[PDB]
């Protein structure tokens, strides 16, 4: 144990969207772009797009020209 391992200091770390604690590790504080426990990407879900379906839009895009209708 003694005289080999790195030590573990108190808590402080910077998130790209807000805050984070714990840290310990080796560094006093570090930077993190993609935040975690906050919200983006599978953390409350932020549906960026939806990936268009052809049954919906393309039936109403090709079908927007309802000249072929009936």
């Amino acid at each position: 144990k003694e005289g080999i391992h790195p030590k573990l200091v108190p808590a402080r770390i910077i998130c790209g969207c807000g805050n984070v604690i714990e840290t310990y590790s080796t560094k006093p504080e570090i930077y993190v772009e993609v935040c975690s426990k906050c919200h983006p990407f599978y953390t409350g879900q932020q549906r960026f797009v939806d990936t268009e379906g052809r049954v919906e839009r393309f039936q109403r895009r090709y079908g927007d020209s309802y000249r072929k209708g009936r």
């Binding site: 052809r54 090709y62 020209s65």
Partner: protein, 82 residues
């Protein structure tokens, strides 16, 4: 790529629409990719001509801008000696 036209064959549609009231039979041919996938009568089979014979293509959503004959290859290839 049309935009204000976006056409289907009148004769393909005539045969397709007057055989669409309250149900039908999948026995329906054609002779023109020229058309378009047509919503409604999705649960249908359209025997498309590939130059030689009438290939029964099946519609199950998914398809739209792809008219017909894309679902009817005209060549065979299959292999080159191997």
């Amino acid at each position: 790529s049309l935009k204000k036209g976006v056409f289907v064959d009148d004769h393909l549609l005539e045969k397709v629409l007057e055989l669409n009231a309250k149900g039908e039979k999948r026995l329906i041919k054609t002779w023109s990719r020229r058309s378009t996938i047509v919503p409604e009568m999705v649960g249908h089979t359209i025997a498309v001509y590939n130059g030689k014979q009438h290939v029964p293509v099946y519609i199950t959503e998914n398809m739209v801008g792809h008219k017909l004959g894309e679902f009817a290859p005209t060549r065979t290839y299959r292999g080159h000696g191997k």
